Ligand binder design. Structure first.
Ligand SMILES: [Mg+2]
Ligand SMILES: [Zn+2]
Ligand SMILES: [Zn+2]
Lengths: 83, 171, 45, 180, 55, 112, 104, 383, 79
DNA sequence: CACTCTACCGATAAGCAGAATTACCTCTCGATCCTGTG
RNA sequence: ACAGAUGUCCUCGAGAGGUA
DNA sequence: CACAGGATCGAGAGGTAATTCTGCTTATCGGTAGAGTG
């Protein structure tokens, strides 16, 4: 089940979430995949991932599972990155 | 006899096609894969209707690699040989083993101990055919076949038919 | 949190040094829940 | 590839039932009241041979107008039916799809009904009874003359004993099929 | 066999016999050999009392 | 009261030498050991005698006895524990594994 | 240390330089440093997994013998200084080779 | 069952959700009862008697003696219960009886507890060792299985040709002992099966139990590749997040890199350098899966790296690696550093880093692990 | 990282599991594209999984011990 | 009102079973006879 | 008509001596 | 001139010290209310 938009988790991005998105984006850019930012002279996939995450231009969705089994989807752009 | 179902197929899209047209890519992949597939559980997927209607969901990215798996929800016409019914077919081949009756996209085989003793193999006529009293079946003829085969669904399905009892002829 | 707590408790035990029982034997008897400890005690106010 | 969730101990039911026989006894996956994609509790369709031809033709012309308008934006009797079917199939589906030609030929040369009003009449007539859609599909697909012939060719029809209304709607189907 | 394997006894019942009675002489320096030739062992088969230095 | 006394004893043991340990760890330990109505010793007869997964329990001690009991009974391993995932060689649902990552079409068509 | 074992009566290993044709399952190390007797003369620098003792044993067409040589240790190298050849108690061949190296 | 729902304590015991606790309660309550009942008073009107359908025969006192059960019948007869009669009794147990006892109707029935068909493990489970030259040996499992087969054949022949009942008993005892030792060679109060040499037979229970068994020594913890170990040393000129990797270790270890734009020139240069120089590659994995060895092939060829290929290049500077010391008491005992290639064969680390590692430079050795994927590298770098 | 070190870096094995059995007694013919379970007569419900070789050995030994470690790729909570 | 064993649980006292930090390096041995045979 | 050789890693359970 | 397959070890005993703290099971006693009377 999905909790509509009456979600109650945290509006910020955890360290584990940041690591997971950074790794997934780094792998995707390392393979032949489109990049939605201006490389601007960067050639390391991880740094490209951080550059994409700088202005929240990563089309990834976080699915936070409740212990019961329900889950709510959080977009990357709507997650505050303070860490 | 044909059935309309709500089957589902999982496609693992590569990140190389993670653009704005990945939806249409999945659409064409579904067309080129599901059509002509002789799935044992279901049968033949003749065609998929409502192309501009089938919906995709959020694709889950596998932990191992960046490829994403999509669980599409399509509906299509499915043909299953099934078991325990009569059906009309048209012959396409004949030999001493039997006649290859064809029903739709099928080729049901009839063995020696299936048809009654009122059929003998001969090649006197132009088409090699089983000829006897009041039975005339040829390469192209009408025949009603009752299916009693075990199908044996292993990546493909089959059928075995019978000619015993009346009404199972040309008519 | 469980693994962190386990490690944070076990590290001082390994770093623990050498009449009320205290130190490694006392920690072992607390963890094992011994029915008869060597040095029982009471405090009355 | 599945459409129904696991229930009634699917893991180790062993031989729950023998495969479908003549006397109905449907399979585990082809049972009545299938699970609908959006919701639930969707009954099995009542699709006959003539209805299948019309449905596939309608899907073909819908897809035809679809990709015809897409590319535009980017930029007798049996004999006549066969040519039209061939020219429609030549570019609509694409790929190989060899089996599509054989089933289309079978539908065209065995079309009991060739009019939308005819199939509408036949399924409005068949909806009166509570028979299994499998039985009505075979009844409307294969023409029959006698009641015993229908019973033998299409088993699991023993619930009808009167055979008066059965003769009536058999004659109705016969005249509808001859009105093609 | 007893002098080589170090198990004091016949080939059978070796698991029930003492082990380590015979050892290869340590020849790396003169002091090591001298210390090895004047070594004793206490078969114990957990207890700190037997390991302490007595008066 | 027993849990409070156990926490006090653990704190006294830890602080005897002079080392400092955060209260959260000791509190978690005493809450885990007293989750039921009595003490649950960290031994074979304590925490290893619960309704957890058979593989996780067998990984600690008495491997074949636990497996024999599970086979004799009807034990279903729902398998979200870390030990079961380690045995099966799958990504455990801990740390970065507590969530799944999905790709949305609208963001793709909006970013590009 | 290397020794010759007398399997049965006539199936006895021999110290000789093996070849890629007659022998089977040879080691990856080189064999040129060996001699006719299968033992390397003292004073020859060796390194890596070079073969120092060449021994072969019969299996029981051609290919009537298989290689059983003992190569040098991969992580060690040096120069052979003394090679000892003698006979064991029964009367077969007994070969010992020593390698000397300096460790700065 | 000896007791039924008529007894109140039986009802309380049956009203237990946990299978183990319910079984223990049932056993404790039914142990006292020692005679079957044909009639039991009802809950209401205790004078009235309601039949329960029992047989009425007295129960035996089951006692374990080695690998056999002896039953004392008191009205005392001392008969040895056979496996056949026990299996027959188990097969007559109703579904509800063992459902309430704790067994499963389909997954684990009580009558399946008696071994009537013994599967044989495949050769992969019990492989044959190489032994020495011109010598072949078999695992203890193979010898035990052969012994079991010989005992079964002997029992079958002895039953077929006609023999005294004592011979049948000794043959069945031998077969049971062999099967038990096949599944457990550490049975207390019984002799331990020896091998031909004299060693105890390594039963599969021993292989599945212990620190070195195939639970903790092969599943909980195993051996991995892309690892190095050498003596550590101090280096005040190295930064906090930096480790001095020797040139030989860096050359030996490799990290696969996907052939893609933005690094194609660098990958081609590394391939051209070869596996001998430190900056270079050892293998070139193709898209199909075939592996090209740059060492053996060489030829100084201008190999064209197509997109999507994998190149196993040597670990270079600023490459995150895992740096661990045993014992690993806390999470700070293993942390991720940055690779800095140094011209000497010893690990070099900052002095302030030794304190969490609890390591000195008197001979300590510490392990190094190299990630083999992008997500693992990112996780190690960010966590 | 833990999963990679446990499986990719040490040992990775691919096996086929019967959808009805839950065990690994499935004969796979990749060249012939045939997957039949003789125990249940199953040919359209075969899945492939990636498990370490140590897990395979443990499961085979357990099966030799007359214990069935049936493996399933779905949750029974939906009943 | 206690006369004699009958049915109940509460203590006590001996027998089993497990299990004992992690990682690493080197050497050194043993993997079978004899009464019964042509 | 036809048809004479090769595929890379083997120990395994133990015992003893040591290093952090 | 010569080879082969199944099992240690035996009445007799005992080839034998270095560990304990649980928990489970099986003997043992130590109690306490009744089936009807003079
Ligand atoms: Mg030190
Ligand atoms: Zn009874
Ligand atoms: Zn199966």
């Amino acid at each position: 089940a999905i909790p509509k938009d009456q979600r109650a988790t945290t509006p910020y991005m955890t360290k584990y979430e940041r690591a997971r998105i950074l790794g997934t984006r780094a792998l995707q850019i390392s393979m032949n995949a489109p990049v939605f930012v201006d490389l601007e002279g960067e050639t390391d996939p991880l740094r490209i991932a951080m550059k994409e995450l700088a202005e929240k231009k990563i089309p990834l969705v976080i699915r936070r599972y409740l212990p019961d089994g329900s889950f709510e989807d959080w977009s990357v752009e709507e997650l505050i990155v303070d860490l | 006899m044909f059935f309309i179902k709500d089957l589902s197929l999982n496609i693992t899209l590569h990140p190389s096609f993670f653009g704005p047209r990945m939806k249409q890519y999945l659409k064409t992949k579904l067309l080129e894969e599901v059509e002509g597939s002789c799935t044992g559980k279901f049968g033949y997927i003749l065609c998929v209707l409502d192309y501009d209607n089938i919906d995709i969901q959020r694709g889950r990215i596998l932990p191992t690699d960046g490829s994403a798996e999509f669980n599409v929800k399509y509906r299509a016409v499915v043909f299953k040989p099934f078991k325990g019914e009569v059906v009309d077919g048209t012959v396409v081949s004949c030999s001493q083993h039997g006649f290859e009756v064809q029903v739709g996209p099928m080729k049901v085989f009839v063995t020696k101990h299936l048809m009654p003793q009122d059929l003998t193999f001969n090649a006197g006529s132009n088409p090699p055919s089983y000829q006897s009293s009041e039975d005339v079946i040829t390469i192209k003829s009408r025949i009603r076949v009752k299916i009693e085969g075990c199908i044996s669904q292993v990546s493909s399905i089959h059928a075995i038919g019978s000619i015993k009892e009346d009404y199972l002829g040309a008519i | 949190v469980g693994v962190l707590a386990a490690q944070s408790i076990g590290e001082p035990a390994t770093q623990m040094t050498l009449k009320v029982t205290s130190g490694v034997p006392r920690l072992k008897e607390i963890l094992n829940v011994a029915k008869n400890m060597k040095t029982p005690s009471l405090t009355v106010y | 590839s599945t459409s129904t969730f696991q229930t009634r101990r699917r893991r180790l039911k062993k031989v729950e039932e023998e495969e479908n026989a003549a006397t109905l006894q449907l399979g585990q996956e082809f049972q009545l009241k299938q699970i609908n994609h959006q919701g639930e509790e969707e009954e099995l369709i009542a699709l006959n041979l003539s209805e299948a031809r019309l449905v596939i033709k309608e899907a073909l012309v819908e897809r035809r107008r679809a990709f015809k308008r897409s590319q535009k934006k980017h930029k007798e009797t049996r004999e006549k039916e066969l040519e039209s079917i061939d020219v429609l199939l030549e570019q609509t589906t694409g790929g190989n799809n060899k089996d599509l030609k054989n089933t289309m030929q079978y539908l065209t040369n065995f079309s009991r009904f060739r009019d939308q009003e005819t199939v509408g009449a036949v399924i409005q007539l068949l909806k009166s009874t509570g028979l299994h859609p499998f039985e009505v599909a075979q009844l409307g697909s294969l023409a029959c003359d006698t009641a015993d012939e229908a019973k033998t060719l299409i088993p699991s029809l023993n619930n009808k004993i009167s055979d008066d209304e059965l003769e009536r709607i058999l004659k109705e189907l016969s005249n509808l099929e001859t009105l093609y | 066999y007893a002098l080589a394997t170090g198990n004091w006894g016949e080939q059978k019942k070796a698991m029930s016999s003492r082990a380590g009675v015979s050892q290869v002489l340590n020849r790396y320096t003169y002091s090591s050999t001298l210390s090895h030739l004047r070594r004793t062992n206490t078969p114990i088969g957990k207890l700190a009392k037997p390991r302490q230095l007595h008066n | 009261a027993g849990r409070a006394a156990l926490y006090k004893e653990v704190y006294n043991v830890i602080a005897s030498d002079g080392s400092y340990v955060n209260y959260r760890h000791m509190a978690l330990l005493v809450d885990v050991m007293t989750t039921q109505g009595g003490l649950t010793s960290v031994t074979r007869h304590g925490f290893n005698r619960s309704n957890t997964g058979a593989l996780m329990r067998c990984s600690f001690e008495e491997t074949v006895e636990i497996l024999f009991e599970a086979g004799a009974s009807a034990e279903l391993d729902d398998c979200r524990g870390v030990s079961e995932n380690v045995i099966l060689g799958q990504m455990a649902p801990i740390g970065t594994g507590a969530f799944d990552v999905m790709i949305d079409e609208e963001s793709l068509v909006k970013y590009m | 240390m290397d020794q010759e074992k007398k399997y049965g009566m006539s199936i006895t290993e021999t110290f000789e330089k093996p070849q890629r044709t007659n022998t089977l399952r040879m080691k990856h190390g080189t064999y040129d440093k060996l001699d006719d007797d299968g033992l390397i003369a003292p004073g020859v620098r060796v390194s890596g997994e070079d073969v120092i003792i060449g021994k072969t044993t019969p299996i029981s067409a051609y290919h009537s013998k298989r290689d059983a040589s003992t190569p040098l240790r991969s992580t060690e190298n040096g120069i052979v200084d003394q090679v000892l050849v003698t006979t064991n108690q029964d009367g077969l061949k007994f070969v010992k080779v020593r390698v000397r190296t300096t460790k700065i | 069952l000896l007791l039924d729902e008529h007894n109140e304590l039986m009802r309380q015991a049956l009203a237990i959700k946990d299978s183990k606790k319910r079984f223990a309660a049932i056993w404790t309550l039914c142990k006292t009862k020692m005679v079957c009942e044909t009639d039991v008073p009802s809950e209401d009107d205790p004078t009235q008697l309601v039949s329960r359908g029992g047989c009425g025969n007295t129960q035996p006192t089951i006692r374990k003696d080695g690998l056999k059960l002896v039953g004392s019948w008191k009205k005392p007869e001392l008969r040895v219960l056979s496996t056949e009669e026990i299996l027959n009794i188990f097969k007559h147990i109703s579904v509800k009886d063992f459902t309430s006892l704790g067994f499963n109707e389909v997954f684990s029935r009580p009558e399946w507890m008696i071994l009537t068909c013994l599967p044989v493990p495949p050769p992969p489970v019990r492989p044959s060792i190489s032994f020495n030259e011109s010598q072949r040996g078999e695992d203890d499992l193979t010898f035990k299985l052969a012994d079991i087969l010989k005992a079964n054949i002997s029992l079958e022949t002895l039953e077929h040709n006609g023999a005294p009942h004592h011979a049948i008993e000794e043959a069945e005892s031998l077969l049971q002992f062999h099967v038990a030792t096949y599944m457990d060679n550490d049975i207390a109060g019984q002799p331990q099966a020896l091998q031909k040499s004299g060693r105890p037979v390594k039963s599969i229970r021993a292989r599945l139990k212990g620190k070195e068994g195939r639970i903790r020594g092969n599943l909980m913890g195993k051996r991995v590749d892309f690892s190095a170990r050498t003596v550590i040393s101090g280096d005040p000129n190295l930064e906090l997040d930096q480790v001095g990797v020797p040139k030989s270790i860096a050359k030996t270890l490799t990290y696969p890199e996907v052939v893609t734009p933005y690094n194609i020139d660098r990958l081609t240069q590394l391939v051209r350098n070869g596996p001998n120089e430190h900056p270079g590659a050892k293998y070139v994995i193709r898209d199909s899966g075939d592996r090209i060895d740059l060492r053996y092939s060489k030829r100084a060829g201008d190999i064209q790296l197509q997109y999507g290929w994998k190149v196993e290049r040597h670990i270079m500077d600023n490459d995150p690696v895992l740096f661990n010391r045993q014992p690993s008491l806390h999470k700070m005992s293993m942390m991720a550093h940055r690779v800095k290639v140094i011209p000497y064969s010893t690990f070099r680390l900052n002095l302030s880093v030794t304190s969490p590692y609890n390591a000195d430079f008197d001979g300590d050795e510490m392990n190094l692990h190299v990630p083999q994927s992008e997500e693992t590298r990112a996780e190690l770098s960010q966590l | 990282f833990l999963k990679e070190r446990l499986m990719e870096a040490s040992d990775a094995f691919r096996v086929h599991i019967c959808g009805i059995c839950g065990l690994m007694t499935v004969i796979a013919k990749l060249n012939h594209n045939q997957f039949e379970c003789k125990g249940c007569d199953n040919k359209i419900d075969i899945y492939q999984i990636h498990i370490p070789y140590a897990a395979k050995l443990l499961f085979q030994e357990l099966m030799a011990m007359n214990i069935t470690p049936r493996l399933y790729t779905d949750r029974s909570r939906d009943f």
